[PDB]
């Protein structure tokens, strides 16, 4: 049982959760492969093991493990495996499932509020436009006037042979990344490709930096299809900062909803390739990775040129400083519309909580380290001083390959 | 099958086929990964020598001739009949570099080839050793203009102790416990103190007091030596546009110089090896500085700042660690003393990766080191995959001789 210490205070704790760590991760006595964001790459007798170990975690957790329904729910997916080859789980398995499987997100620095998720049964869906109508409830649901609400909507779980439900944006809200004269970007740079695949669909283009991309929804065999996302369905915050007047006129906007739309969902070996899921926002995320990253929107540069900061030296720190005001703006702009966030402060500490809690209930928590640390000031927040074993629990979000 | 390496700024992918040589295992498995942890005869001497000797006879373009199978040859007759051997001056110099180039937590081996060996085998004392590192501090010191180096005290070996340096660090500020149960100095280094203290050290009573040596020669307790004032270059801090961050009284000391790790050469194990190289400025100024468990003054330069510290939204963490480092950035700089800031330090650290890898195939980098403790994706490291493992030559941590 790996020993943990957390350098900040000198306590110690032991992970005997990763005991039970089964599907194994990248990292051998020889070379450790943390750092690398994907992990390697992307007869039914298996099915029946994962299931069973997954029904019987949930009435340990309802203190129902021995006698009564324990008993009689094990032999009927017993029974609907050994008569159709799969097996449907019952609803509030489906919502057990997917807080299990938030709970057990390693990279995930929002975990102290994996109980409160609302989760959506859509496995009764089978078109495109009955996805759209789901997809638009939830953001709906989840935006919620600014106030906003965890939500995972499930979609029917993946069955041998005929074809997945599937979102190909790899979020629901994802802005224009359009290519040009000189192969440069306007827009963002991380949707490029699947700008490219929307306009070769049929999808009109657009202005410029900021366009609210459609969604490329997918039923079963029946090739993907275009669909518009309702403006007044999708809330966005122009930023502002609170002193510095004209960062507004940079004309800059970010959406308010997170919402993952790209991952598969695992519990109890049941695969659900269609299973978005949406929170809120780490400021972090917005202010630091998705507009001063070198790759995304780099704004970094001019802002420093606005705030007149010497950008002729390194060692000037005007990289930080700018950085640090997009920050500010981010988290003002928010607050002055009413739209949920957290700073990267406030959801460390409560990922700390998280820890503790975690200890307690279950013996240790996965956390991996890179992805927990805020993207600036990481040696401020508690989290840097804790150490963090990570490792792969089920229920689970995995990646999965595009379809294409 | 060798790892797949993506940076993830540009786009890039390389395998790094050094990681198959790995000549050692670390903490990690399949099952967990346990890469943020902090803590990680004759003929296993032999077959590391014979690697050792490998390697030396490779870097002077010079595998498989006579004289390195004659270098072969000798060794492991060495071994046969003292249990041991020597290092060629040559080859320690060699080994010291390599050892240095494969230290995956460091973000300045870009440096490695520029190292000065003082070659202290021949240390008979503790007073020789005292004279030994004067000498390495003066040197590498240089009137603010640092120089990298290492000083090599004898090996570990049969029939004697070891030469152990207590201190984890050449220079160390005192740290003293309180009424408050607090602590005035530095607190990482109370231990220390306390040692010193009970050795015979008249401790001081201020913030920023320098540390005495405890040396320890073979089968010989700990002996007490200070440190000439004049020899231990120091800055005091000052901030740029922020006229009352000098009345904070803080100061640091010009060199890095680490103290308490094992240098291992072929299978020869140097416990007394310090080495030095000049300071990025966030070790001082994020870590030193705003750690909680270290001088902790985030708080009062915020209140100073005028910060609203209320709430954590403004941000005042942020914007008070950014000063903070600007301060020791302007005041080492004015005191004319090498420094390098993240962004230069990072950047110098991809040439070295990109080296590496035309070089060796590789390089092993453990990311969680590597990153600086503020601005993390602002630095180009950030967005680059990396493998960690261990190569030999190589620094290890060993346990504190009392
Ligand atoms: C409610 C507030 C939430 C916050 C503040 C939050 C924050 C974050 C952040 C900052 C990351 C880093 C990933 C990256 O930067 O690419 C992350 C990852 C992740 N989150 Fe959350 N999250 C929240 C809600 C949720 C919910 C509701 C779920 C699932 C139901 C979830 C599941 C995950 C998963 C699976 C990852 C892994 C990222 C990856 O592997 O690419 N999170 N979260
Ligand atoms: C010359 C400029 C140098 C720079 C800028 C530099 C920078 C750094 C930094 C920032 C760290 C980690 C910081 C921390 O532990 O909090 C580090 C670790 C390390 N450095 Fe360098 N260093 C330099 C010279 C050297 C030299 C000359 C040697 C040895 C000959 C060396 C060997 C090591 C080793 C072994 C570690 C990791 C040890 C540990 O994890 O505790 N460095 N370096
Ligand atoms: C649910 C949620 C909350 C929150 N605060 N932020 C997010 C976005 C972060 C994220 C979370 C996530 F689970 C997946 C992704 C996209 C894939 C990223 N890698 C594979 C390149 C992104 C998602
Ligand atoms: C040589 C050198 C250069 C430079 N810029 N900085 C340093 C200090 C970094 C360092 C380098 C080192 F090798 C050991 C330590 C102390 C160990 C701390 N761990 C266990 C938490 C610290 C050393
Ligand atoms: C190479 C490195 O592992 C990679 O850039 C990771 C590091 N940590 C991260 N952490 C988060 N939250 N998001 C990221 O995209 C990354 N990128
Ligand atoms: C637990 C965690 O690994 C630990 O606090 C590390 C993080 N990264 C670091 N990076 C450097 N350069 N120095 C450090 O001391 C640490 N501490
Ligand atoms: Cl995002
Ligand atoms: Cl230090
Ligand atoms: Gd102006
Ligand atoms: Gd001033
Ligand atoms: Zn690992």
């Not at 019952?90 to 299990?100: H, M, N, P, T, W």
Request: proline share 7%.
């Amino acid at each position: 049982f790996p020993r943990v210490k957390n350098w900040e205070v000198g306590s110690i704790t032991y992970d005997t959760l990763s005991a039970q760590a089964q599907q194994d991760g990248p990292c051998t006595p020889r070379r450790c492969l943390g750092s690398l964001v994907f992990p390697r790459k992307l007869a039914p007798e298996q099915l029946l093991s994962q299931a069973r170990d997954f029904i019987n975690q949930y009435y340990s957790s309802i203190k129902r493990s021995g006698s009564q329904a324990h008993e009689q729910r094990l032999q009927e997916v017993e029974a609907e495996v050994a008569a159709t080859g799969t097996y449907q789980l019952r609803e509030s398995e489906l919502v057990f499932g997917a807080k299990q499987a938030w709970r057990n997100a390693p990279r995930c620095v929002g975990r102290i509020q994996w109980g409160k998720l609302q989760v959506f049964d859509a496995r009764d869906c089978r078109s495109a436009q009955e996805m759209f109508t789901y997809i638009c409830n939830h953001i709906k649901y989840a935006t919620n006037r600014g106030n906003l609400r965890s939500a995972i909507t499930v979609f029917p779980q993946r069955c041998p042979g005929r074809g997945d439900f599937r979102i190909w944006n790899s979020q629901l809200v994802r802005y224009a990344g359009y290519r040009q004269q000189d192969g440069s970007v306007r827009g963002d740079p991380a949707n490029v490709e699947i700008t490219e695949l929307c306009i070769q669909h049929g999808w009109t283009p657009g202005n410029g930096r900021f366009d609210v991309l459609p969604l490329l929804l997918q039923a079963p065999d029946e090739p993907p299809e275009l669909f518009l996302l309702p403006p007044e369905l999708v809330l966005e915050v122009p930023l502002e900062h609170p002193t510095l007047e004209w960062f507004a006129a940079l004309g800059l906007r970010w959406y308010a909803l997170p919402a993952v739309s790209n991952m598969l969902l695992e519990i109890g070996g049941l695969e659900f390739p269609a299973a978005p899921f949406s929170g809120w926002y780490m400021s972090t995320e917005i202010g630091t990775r998705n507009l001063c990253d070198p790759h995304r929107y780099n704004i970094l540069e001019d802002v420093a040129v606005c705030m007149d900061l010497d950008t002729r030296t390194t060692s000037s720190l005007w990289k930080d400083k700018a950085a640090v005001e997009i920050n500010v703006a981010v988290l003002h702009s928010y607050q002055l519309a009413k739209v949920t966030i957290v700073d990267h402060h406030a959801a460390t500490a409560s990922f700390m909580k998280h820890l503790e809690n975690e200890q307690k209930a279950r013996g240790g928590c996965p956390a991996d380290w890179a992805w927990i640390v805020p993207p600036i000031s990481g040696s401020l927040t508690p989290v840097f001083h804790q150490e963090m074993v990570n490792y792969f629990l089920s229920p689970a979000f995995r990646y999965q390959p595009d379809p294409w």
